[PDB]
Amino acid sequence: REIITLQLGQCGNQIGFEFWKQLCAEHGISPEGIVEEFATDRKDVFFYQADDEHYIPRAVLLDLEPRVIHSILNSPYAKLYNPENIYLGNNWASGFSQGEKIHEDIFDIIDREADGSDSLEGFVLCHSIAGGTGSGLGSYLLERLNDRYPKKLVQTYSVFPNQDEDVVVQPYNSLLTLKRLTQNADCVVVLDNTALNRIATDRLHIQNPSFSQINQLVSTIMSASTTTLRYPGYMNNDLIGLIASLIPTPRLHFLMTGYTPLTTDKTTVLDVMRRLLQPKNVMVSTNHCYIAILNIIQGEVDPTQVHKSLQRIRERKLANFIPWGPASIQVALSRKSPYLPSAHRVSGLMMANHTSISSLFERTCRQYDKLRKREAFLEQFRKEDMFKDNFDEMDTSREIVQQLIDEYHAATRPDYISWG
Amino acid sequence: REIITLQLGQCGNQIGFEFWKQLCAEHGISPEGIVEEFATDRKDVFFYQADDEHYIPRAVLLDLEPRVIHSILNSPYAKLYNPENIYLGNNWASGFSQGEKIHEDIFDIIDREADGSDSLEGFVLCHSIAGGTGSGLGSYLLERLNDRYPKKLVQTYSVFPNQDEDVVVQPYNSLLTLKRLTQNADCVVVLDNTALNRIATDRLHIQNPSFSQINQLVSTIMSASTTTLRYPGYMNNDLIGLIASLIPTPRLHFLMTGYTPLTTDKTTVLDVMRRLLQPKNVMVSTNHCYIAILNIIQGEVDPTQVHKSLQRIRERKLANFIPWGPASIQVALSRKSPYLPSAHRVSGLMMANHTSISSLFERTCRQYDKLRKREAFLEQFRKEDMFKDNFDEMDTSREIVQQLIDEYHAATRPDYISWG
Amino acid sequence: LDVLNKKYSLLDHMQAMRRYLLLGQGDFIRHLMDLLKPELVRPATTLYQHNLTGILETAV
Ligand SMILES: Nc1nc2c(ncn2[C@@H]2O[C@H](COP(=O)(O)OP(=O)(O)O)[C@@H](O)[C@H]2O)c(=O)[nH]1
Ligand SMILES: Nc1nc2c(ncn2[C@@H]2O[C@H](COP(=O)(O)OP(=O)(O)O)[C@@H](O)[C@H]2O)c(=O)[nH]1
């Protein structure tokens, strides 16, 4: 079934704008959505088919207090995305309240696309955590979608924000987003501003314009995470079929990223795998262990020897994984696209469930716990107090996320066989 | 055999004027009825063959308090329709009484034509429901025709009026017309002013001159509903042969309309069928289901694909029906005419028995029920009271139409095998 | 061999005798299995071939 992407918030709208542009050039599409004359791919899932081959992405663009939604409109690609579905504070509470009054018209825009498509399998959100308007509005829309589509599943390309710690309420906003995310999201893929900023400092000298350049880094991961769906093959055809292996228990569902050619601009499979497991290639910032790992490779990989390769990785004991029950490394292979320069033909990404990401969640919980005692930034803005007089959703969020922090470390233990 | 059209009332006279004009250009006829140098059709059923090729339509034009019958006379086509048969209130009762005094001369005009034809097959009325003079006169003439021609059938191109609800007695007039129409009309084809007005707003910006432009829309449907009869071929050559499939119960004889290229100004059969089942192409405004569906296509249509095409729509199931009947969607094909434009080389129409039309009948019954309690507009005009002192025909009509409203919903149920 | 490979395309078939029959097509085989679920879950001692030939066509 076709995937509908609910890109929301200025930051989220920036990475959806680029992700669709990235698949414009990668696929046979021009800036006006017209089939390219120069042009073997499954474009049905991501791109709606118009009568005259105007393959329009099924993007839902939500603008709140818009500024960069106006810049998106003055672009050569304005015609490419024309489902004609764009509808008009820095606080999580401020975003949640604004979303509630306009919920029905934004929700009808969701319906239109659902009716238009032959079918709808998942809602992929370009969410921004502690995103000012992006968070709060995104949590609320996350709660409505599951109730309306109980059978359907929701993924989140959460750009978890770590900038070395401006938002003084950033921990409070993030704390609330996760509680909604931990129980109202089927899957989440985690990214880190600092981890990518550190990569940007590593591969390039770019430091001050970190947000503009890092957009390309988030994009390469995003296009790549879907390439096994966007191009066809004998295994991992549909989204869910792929989602199951990466998330082994509903509570434990945040995914780490990695790209072997971080410096993207021959190499044997044995090499591209080893390079990935190294930590400089990783884009995320008591024993600790992965729960299950997966990898996808797109290039002139010799497909016959991707087995002999795995046997070697297994004996070098380069990876630990989990003691409770069975898990294993999983090799997957795809076609890099033609048309675009296939320089560095072999490029590999990995998506993995790792207990280290618990540490990033605890750091915002640490900032929040410190901030909660001080009550330095309760906002006490009438919106904040009137929306939350008890201020107990933050405590409800604190116990839920602490259960998650606890559940992760329980996975490290030998007995997730007993309750976690 | 030959069909005589009893166009009556100002509104009805407007759509008969245009329908005959539409078949003037479509067929080989000029504005003086003479054949033209530029112009294989069974012209006979719809046109009397004079001696010097003056193919005069067998139109019966009835004028009551005439205003738009004088404008019809000052036209270039005045010579085209010369059977020399035109004979001289806004209330249903006011129209019915006026018809009764002149019934014998209007009825002799019916006889004259009936004598002229070899075999008379049917009386097709360009009826206007709640048409002021058009309704009441039309109901009375509907009752006389069946008694005189018990073997013969009567169809009604009823322009059921929905203008968002000026006539303050409009529901009362309409209520009475249907009671006559349910027991004294073998077939009825329903059209809606609002449904077409909504189409006019959709295809064009025309809003204020809704009546003049919508005339063309009613015409395209009217010419089209008969094209299988007018042209040669072994395709449903006669009216009655076609009527049987669309109407499967004596009581439910109301037919819905649709046109695949509302914007008619190549396309495969698989496409023109799917487009039609969609509800924008429809021109009419608890489970609900069609009773039996039929379609006719006139253009450059391949023959081999139709079976492939018949099967494809069945798998899509765009049309959902579960009637007491075992009826199936039926494919029919005709020739587009030469001379006139061949734009939308393939272009189609559908006539179907749908239980949704019950809802439109109930809405006027709702306005009437509300109006009946208030008795706000009993007219109490001496014509209205003297003609109807008991005012019990309205109640007789209310039970008969309620039986119809009930019968329809009984059709939806699994046991219309038992009494409605 | 030349004529076999342009007048009967002996090779283009081998590429489409694995792509479709051995499940290598991947996508065609998951949209057929989705649309064939209601019909198949019913005992096929009562199944008719006119509804299978019809649904594969939708899938292709
Ligand atoms: N990865 C990435 N993150 C961004 C970018 N721009 C803003 N952000 C993030 O967006 C978050 C704040 O969202 P904000 O821009 O305030 O949304 P606004 O309220 O609509 O302005 C911060 O945590 C930033 O890390 C960008 O270009 N790339
Ligand atoms: N479709 C259509 N309906 C019309 C047109 N003119 C009038 N009507 C309908 O005719 C009905 C009223 O009839 P009316 O014109 O009052 O008849 P009169 O009593 O002779 O004037 C209304 O319900 C209108 O919807 C037209 O040009 N097109």
From Swiss-Prot, chains A, B:
SUPFAM superfamilies: Tubulin C-terminal domain-like (SSF55307), Tubulin nucleotide-binding domain-like (SSF52490). GTP binds at A130, G131, G132, T133, G134, S135, G136. It is found in: Cytoplasm, Cytoskeleton, Microtubule organizing center, Centrosome; Cytoplasm, Cytoskeleton, Spindle. Phosphorylation at Ser-119 by BRSK1 regulates centrosome duplication, possibly by mediating relocation of gamma-tubulin and its associated proteins from the cytoplasm to the centrosome. CDD domains: gamma_tubulin (cd02188). The keyword Phosphoprotein applies. Pfam families: Tubulin, Tubulin_C. The keyword Acetylation does not apply. GO terms for cellular component: apical part of cell; cell leading edge; centriole; centrosome; ciliary basal body; condensed nuclear chromosome; cytoplasm; cytoplasmic microtubule. The modification Phosphoserine is found at S119. SMART domains: Tubulin (SM00864), Tubulin_C (SM00865). GO terms for molecular function: GTP binding; identical protein binding; microtubule nucleator activity; structural constituent of cytoskeleton. Belongs to the tubulin family. Tubulin is the major constituent of microtubules, protein filaments consisting of alpha- and beta-tubulin heterodimers. Gamma-tubulin is a key component of the gamma-tubulin ring complex (gTuRC) which mediates microtubule nucleation. The gTuRC regulates the minus-end nucleation of alpha-beta tubulin heterodimers that grow into microtubule protafilaments, a critical step in centrosome duplication and spindle formation. This is Tubulin gamma-1 chain. It comes from Homo sapiens (Human). The lineage of its organism: Eukaryota, Metazoa, Chordata, Craniata, Vertebrata.
Swiss-Prot record, chain C:
It comes from the Eukaryota. Ubiquitously expressed. It is found in: Cytoplasm, Cytoskeleton, Microtubule organizing center, Centrosome. Belongs to the TUBGCP family. Component of the gamma-tubulin ring complex (gTuRC) consisting of TUBGCP2, TUBGCP3, TUBGCP4, TUBGCP5 and TUBGCP6 and gamma-tubulin TUBG1 or TUBG2. TUBGCP2, TUBGCP3, TUBGCP4, TUBGCP5 and TUBGCP6 assemble in a 5:5:2:1:1 stoichiometry; each is associated with a gamma-tubulin, thereby arranging 14 gamma-tubulins in a helical manner. Gamma-tubulin at the first position is blocked by TUBGCP3 at the last position, allowing 13 protafilaments to grow into a microtubule. Component of the gamma-tubulin ring complex (gTuRC) which mediates microtubule nucleation. The gTuRC regulates the minus-end nucleation of alpha-beta tubulin heterodimers that grow into microtubule protafilaments, a critical step in centrosome duplication and spindle formation. This is Gamma-tubulin complex component 3. It comes from Homo sapiens (Human). The chain holds residues 546 to 605 of 907 of the full protein.
